[PDB]
Amino acid sequence: SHPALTQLRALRYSKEIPALDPQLLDWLLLEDSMTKRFEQQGKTVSVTMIREGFVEQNEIPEELPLLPKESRYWLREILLSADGEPWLAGRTVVPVSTLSGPELALQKLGKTPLGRYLFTSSTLTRDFIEIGRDAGLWGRRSRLRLSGKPLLLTELFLPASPLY
């Protein structure tokens, strides 16, 4: 798709959280998407849609080992901008079994940027977070649970983002 997503997918992720400045850790460990924290930088946050649709296991090689093995998944890749400047690339993989109740909205976000603020009646927990780095750029990979149901979220922080 877009080179930022190719880069994101190839980062070598692990559960090692490096000994970074506390503010950088706070950014990387946030238990939510970056949408509202990026807005708090005094910016309007928007989504550039790179790809969205139902896919088979063959299109989620990175996420499959981390999710239930089933027939279909919703795959969403975006670039997230702040006042029109790209700050992050995001790739979300949602097993179709997770699409129930309020979580059905995960396949209907369109250009609405993901965040806990969209799920006012759902608990959000994180099974684990992995961190990776490539060409000076930090990325992270999380298995999240919304009302107990899994989804995979991988994010790459682009050069203009506030982490740098």
Grouping H, G, I as helix, E, B as strand and the rest as coil, residue 33 is coil
163 vs 56, 85, 105, CA distance in Å?
Answer: 34, 14, 29
User: Using an 8 Å Cβ cutoff, are 129 and 29 in contact?
Assistant: yes
72 vs 41, 53, 68, 98, 143, CA distance in Å?
Answer: 37, 10, 10, 11, 17
Residue located via tokens 């609405």? 112
> What class does CATH assign to 1-164?
alpha beta
Phi, psi of 7 (to 5 degrees): -60, -50
Which residues participate in the annotated binding site?
34, 76, 114, 155
- For residues 1 and 70, give the distance between their C-alpha atoms in angstroms, rounded to a whole number: 24
Which residues participate in the annotated binding site for substrate?
34, 76, 114, 155
Residue located via tokens 């682009």? 158
Residue located via tokens 């400045």? 21
